[PDB]
Each structure stands twice: as structure tokens, then as C-alpha cells.
């Protein structure tokens, strides 16, 4: 099972007083004169449980509280009482057990399970509690346990599954006894200590104001496209403004733009009827979508459109804005066309003569300042950008930090996010090259954006863990083998695991680091195979390799 339990062999506080209620409580108490009464739980000290002479009153109200001795009211040394309280999903659950003892001033060593006693469906946040009246308090954490049911369904024994190596072994082999051998239980990975960010030290902001707060937008058949590069791209300005009618990003999350780093960035500007605004979307059809501006089916960018009634209308309606409306072919995506040939409708060539069987391929707008919003002018901007893993010339606002070497860290060089250990390189980059790569197409070297030096990258160490044991029939002692690591890098219940992290019994083999075994100079027949010509056994008593 995997649930909230009291970890084995731990401190219980020993009262003989407001207390917290982190996740659960193991309360216990031994007495002879029933000097203890009950409990008060809640937040701003809320429910109450008391037991005077005979009847036990369990009531939830709001009260007035130094105690001594309404949504529900379920009213109704020799001894040791054990209780477990927890609060899950609006229910409050109480388990309990009684037992006779003859012992003083200390908890007995024994095993006994706790049958459930009650569930009450209150639904109140609880973070503190207090007793009412020698009593012991513990706490519950998420753990894994192995429980043993006998013939009649009573739990008679259990194994904590993270106390020490032997317990982990007994978990993987779902059994309570272990035969002599070597077993492979878990993996071991070093963990990053810090974080590093390195961006170039330019400060000029990108010129979004020019594009957005412009003067005269171009007509749709000839849309102006401006490249943006070599500038910090802060989007908070576009964030604050609330006068937008559409702000939608396709290949990215619109609220993460301040963190990315883009390779190539283009801004397209123009002005359209409101009714045709829907036509700015991949895969759509229409006259705009087929004759004036086509978006690809794998688009990656943002579309930002808003209304411009109070800026783009003449007294009788502005007529400057124009659009193609008669073309012999559809537009492939991102294709501009500003030819001025009369569209032939009949079977006689126009020869520059409009009229019969000949129409001009363009048509203008009338922006009367009193039309419906379906006809008022709309200013639209399209940001399209490519988002490889690359030098990424365009980068958002972010603060650079220092450089750290020879430690498993977590780095980001201009969007080259990763983790590993950075050392100094003996490689010879060429003045145009930005980073290296291995046979399997793995990044393994970078160039510092701010000092232009070459750093090698190696992954942080990791491996498997195995447990050497003579059979539990013989002893309870074990040794541990960390596969293919260097004994320096080995650093967990401190009274149990930390013993297998340090000591005078560290041995370094060709197969890993061996801890808990003593390296003799003799030679015997192989008993337990470690590897590379090294065996291990149990002799005179301890474990030898």
C-alpha cells in the first residue's frame, strides 16, 4: 500500500498546549485513572469531542475557549489507548485501539493494528488541535508499506519500505525473507544545485510602438512586412493595453512570450473590414484568404487585431484603402501580388481595355464613420516567428547570472536549456560557429555569449544500486554497490541509510563503489558475484570482498 503512515523508528513528542495538524495525527496515551477527556480541532482556536462520566458527545459548532474539565451533534500503568486522526476529502476519519500494559514511563515495543472507528462528514479545514483532560504525539507522511494478512484477515506484521536497504530489498521481492544473493533495487541520480542564465548584454527595446502606434497602415493587397532583430522584446506593453478585439497565438502560449527566444521574427500590418476579420486564420477560405493574404497550415505566431473607427474614416468615407478582388489564381501562403492587369472575364483579350468582358482586379473601401461595426475599419498586426533551438538572436527580458564550473547545474544559454556539468574546452571552434555536437546529434559544447569561450558539457552522474546480502536466515547485515560511479560523488533515513554513505569501508572496484564490505588480501572460491573478477562473502563476523 501507498498512503499516509507514521514512519518507523521516529521521534514522537512527549507531553506530560496548542499543536499543529499538518496532515494527520497519531495520538497515544497510557493511564489508569481516565485523567484524559477529549479533543478540540479547528483553525481559529471547529469541532469538539468530549467524554464525561459515560456518554461521548461529538459536536461541531462555534465555541468559546484555557480549556479544562451547530451543523452536527452525534451525541450518545494499566491501559493504553491509540488513535489516528486524519481529514480527507471532506470526511474526518478516526481509527483506534485499546490494549492492556504493565510498564512505566515509556512506549512498549509491539505491533498491533488499528481498526477504523468512525467517519464523520463535516468538511471543515483543520490546522490545529488541543487535548482536554502522559501522552504521545506523532505525524503522518506519505510512505509505502508492505502489510501481511494472516488466515483470518488480521494484519500481523508490516515492513516500512524506505527505512534502510534491507527493507527496500524486501519490498522489491514481495516477501519477508531474502535468500543469499545480490539484488538490484533502485536507481541513483545526482541532482542539480543551482541555475545559470546567460544572455547578451544589449538593452535596446524592440520597436513595437512604431508598428502598433503607427500613422498610416498599408492596404491589404500590399501589406508591409518588417523584420525585427537585435533587441530585447518585452511584451508587457501589449499586455497592459486592453483595447484589443483579438489576441490569439497559435504555436505557443500567449502568456509565456516573455521567456522564449526567437530566431526570425516578422511583423505584418494592414487594415480590413471587420466582417473579413474571421478570414485571418489558417485553413480558411474567402476572397481575402485566397486573393490577398494566405496563412500557412503550420503557422506559428500571434494575430493581434483591434478597431480603428476613430482614425481611418473620411467625412464621406475614406476611399484610399484598396484590395484585389479578381485574380486568375489563388494565393500560396505568404505570397504578395501587386500587379495591375485588367481581369479578363470573356474570351477576348482585354488589351488594356476595361468594360465588356474586362474588369479591374481591384476594389476600394468606403469607411463611412456611422456604419455598423461589421464595416468599420480594423487594424491588424501579425507576428510570425521561427522557434528552433539555436543562437536565437531575439530574446526576451531576463537577467544574466555568473558562471559555475565543475558542478551539476541547470543552464540556459540563449535558449539552449539543459542540465549538466560545464568544463573548459580544448576544442577549436571557428569564428562563425556557435556550438558543437556529437555523433548522435547531442549538444556537447557551447560558446559563452558574454565572454566568447568554449565550454564542454557532460551529463550528471547516475547509475543503479544493488544490495549484497547473506540470507536473512543468517544475518541482518548488508552491503551496497553503486554501479559505475566514483566513490567521491556518493553522498535517506540518517540512522539507517546515512551509515551506508560514509565510513572506513569504502572500496572502489571496476564495477562501481562498494560500501559496507572489507577488502581482504586472500582469495577463495566465488560465493556472491560482484563483477570484474571480484566476489563477496560472509565470513569471520562481517562481509568481505
Amino acid at each position, epitope marked *: 500500500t501507498q498512503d499516509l503512515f507514521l514512519p518507523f523508528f521516529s521521534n514522537v513528542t512527549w507531553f506530560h498546549p496548542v499543536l499543529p495538524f499538518n496532515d494527520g495525527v497519531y495520538f497515544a496515551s497510557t493511564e489508569k485513572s481516565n485523567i484524559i477527556r477529549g479533543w478540540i480541532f479547528g483553525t481559529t482556536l471547529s469541532l469538539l469531542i468530549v467524554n464525561n462520566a459515560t456518554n461521548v458527545v461529538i459536536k461541531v459548532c462555534e465555541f468559546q475557549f484555557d480549556p479544562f474539565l451547530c451543523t452536527f451533534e452525534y451525541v450518545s500503568f494499566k491501559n493504553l489507548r491509540e488513535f489516528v486522526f486524519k481529514n480527507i476529502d471532506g470526511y474526518f476519519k478516526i481509527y483506534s485501539k485499546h490494549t492492556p500494559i504493565n510498564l512505566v514511563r515509556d512506549l512498549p515495543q509491539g505491533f498491533s493494528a488499528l481498526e477504523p472507528l468512525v467517519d464523520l462528514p463535516i468538511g471543515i479545514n483543520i490546522t490545529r488541535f488541543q487535548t482536554l483532560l502522559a501522552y504521545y504525539v506523532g505525524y503522518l507522511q506519505p510512505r509505502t508499506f508492505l502489510l501481511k494478512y494472516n488466515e483470518n484477515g488480521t494484519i500481523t506484521d508490516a515492513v516500512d519500505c524506505a527505512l534502510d536497504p534491507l527493507s527496500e530489498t524486501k519490498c522489491t521481492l514481495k516477501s519477508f525473507t531474502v535468500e543469499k544473493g545480490i539484488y538490484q533495487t533502485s536507481n541513483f541520480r545526482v541532482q542539480p544545485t543551482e541555475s545559470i542564465v546567460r544572455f547578451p548584454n544589449i538593452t535596446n527595446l524592440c520597436p513595437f510602438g512604431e508598428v502598433f502606434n503607427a500613422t498610416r497602415f498599408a492596404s491589404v493587397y500590399a501589406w508591409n512586412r518588417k523584420r525585427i532583430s537585435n533587441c530585447v522584446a518585452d511584451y508587457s506593453v501589449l499586455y497592459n493595453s486592453a*483595447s484589443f*478585439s483579438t*489576441f490569439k497565438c497559435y504555436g505557443v502560449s500567449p*502568456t509565456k512570450l516573455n521567456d522564449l527566444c526567437f530566431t526570425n521574427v516578422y511583423a505584418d500590418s494592414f487594415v480590413i473590414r*471587420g466582417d473579413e476579420v474571421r478570414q485571418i486564420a489558417p485553413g480558411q477560405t474567402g476572397k481575402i484568404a485566397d486573393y490577398n493574404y494566405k496563412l500557412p497550415d503550420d503557422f506559428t505566431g500571434c*494575430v493581434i487585431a483591434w*478597431n480603428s*473607427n476613430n482614425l481611418d474614416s473620411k467625412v464621406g468615407g475614406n476611399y484610399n484603402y484598396l484590395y484585389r478582388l479578381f485574380r486568375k489564381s489563388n494565393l500560396k501562403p505568404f505570397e504578395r501580388d501587386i500587379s495591375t492587369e485588367i481581369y479578363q472575364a470573356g474570351s477576348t483579350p482585354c488589351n488594356g481595355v476595361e468594360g465588356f468582358n474586362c474588369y479591374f482586379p481591384l476594389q476600394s473601401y468606403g469607411f463611412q464613420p456611422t456604419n*455598423g*461595426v461589421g464595416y468599420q475599419p480594423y487594424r491588424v498586426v501579425v507576428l510570425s516567428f521561427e522557434l528552433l533551438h539555436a543562437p536565437a538572436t531575439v530574446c526576451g527580458p531576463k537577467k544574466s547570472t555568473n558562471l559555475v564550473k565543475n558542478k551539476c547545474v541547470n543552464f540556459n544559454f540563449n535558449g539552449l536549456t539543459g542540465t549538466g556539468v560545464l568544463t573548459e574546452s580544448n576544442k577549436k571552434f571557428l569564428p562563425f560557429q556557435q556550438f558543437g555536437r556529437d555523433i548522435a546529434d547531442t549538444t556537447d559544447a557551447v560558446r559563452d555569449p558574454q565572454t566568447l569561450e568554449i565550454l564542454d558539457i557532460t551529463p550528471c552522474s547516475f547509475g543503479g544500486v544493488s544490495v549484497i546480502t547473506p540470507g536473512t536466515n543468517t544475518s541482518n547485515q548488508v552491503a551496497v554497490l553503486y554501479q559505475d560511479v566514483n566513490c567521491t560523488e556518493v553522498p535517506q533515513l540518517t540512522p539507517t541509510w546515512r551509515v551506508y554513505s560514509t565510513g572506513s569501508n569504502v572500496f572502489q572496484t571496476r564495477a562501481g563503489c562498494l560500501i559496507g564490505a572489507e577488502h581482504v588480501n586472500n582469495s577463495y572460491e566465488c560465493d556472491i558475484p560482484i563483477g570484474a573478477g571480484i566476489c563477496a562473502s560472509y565470513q569471520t563476523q562481517s562481509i568481505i570482498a
Partner: nanobody
Framework: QVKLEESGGGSVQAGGSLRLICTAP????????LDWYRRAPGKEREFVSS???????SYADSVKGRFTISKDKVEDTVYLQMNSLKPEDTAIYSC???????????????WGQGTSVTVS
């Protein structure tokens, strides 16, 4: 600086019929819900109808049966068909829609002007 509109009202006799079209241009991208409210003289505004992005329609007690709220597939146009009208339907109706601000596109709520539905 108005992102919404109300349209489709008019004066029709009792038992008549009419068509309402609340037209916003960027509703397809926003994917927010739409509400019709009404205000008749001598009282306060009341809920008329509601449509979600998935078409789960909800109607007022008085208008259900002939007032049908619907949404077109394209062009971001909605309808509220009215039939079986009665003279007390003469009121001012209004829309309400949501718009983008800091990324997500439904935070800013916005009521249009409203249109006069005058039944005789």
C-alpha cells in the same frame, strides 16, 4: 472604441416575428459565451437567454418555445429568433461578451448598447 453591437430590433404586432443579430468580429478566436439580457420600463434588467461555446442554450421562462438562440458556424454571427410575440415584449435588449487582456481572451466583460423590441 466599441467592440460589440446590438442589432435586429424593430416594431412588430403581437404574435409577430423578428430576428436579432449580435455581431462581434473576434468571437471565433475568443471562444467566450454570450448572454442576452432585457430591460422593460418600470423595472430592472432580467436575463433573456444564454449560449455557450458548445451550444447549450438556455432561455427565459417567458420567451422559451418561440425565442430560439443560435450561433452560426462562421462570420461570428448569432441569432435570437422571436415569434409568438406579445405587446409586453416592448423593451430594450442588450448583449454581453468577453475580450482579451493579459493573454487569456475572456477576462474583460462588455455589454453592448441594446436594441428596441417593440411589440404591439
Amino acid at each position: 472604441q466599441v467592440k460589440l453591437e446590438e442589432s435586429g430590433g424593430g416594431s412588430v404586432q403581437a404574435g409577430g416575428s423578428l430576428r436579432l443579430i449580435c455581431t462581434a468580429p473576434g468571437l471565433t478566436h475568443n471562444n467566450c459565451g454570450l448572454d442576452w439580457y432585457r430591460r422593460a420600463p418600470g423595472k430592472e434588467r432580467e436575463f433573456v437567454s444564454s449560449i455557450s461555446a458548445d451550444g447549450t442554450t438556455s432561455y427565459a421562462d417567458s420567451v422559451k418555445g418561440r425565442f430560439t438562440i443560435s450561433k452560426d458556424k462562421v462570420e461570428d454571427t448569432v441569432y435570437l429568433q422571436m415569434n409568438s410575440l406579445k405587446p409586453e415584449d416592448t423593451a430594450i435588449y442588450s448583449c454581453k461578451t468577453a475580450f482579451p487582456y493579459f493573454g487569456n481572451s475572456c477576462v474583460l466583460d462588455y455589454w453592448g448598447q441594446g436594441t428596441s423590441v417593440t411589440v404591439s
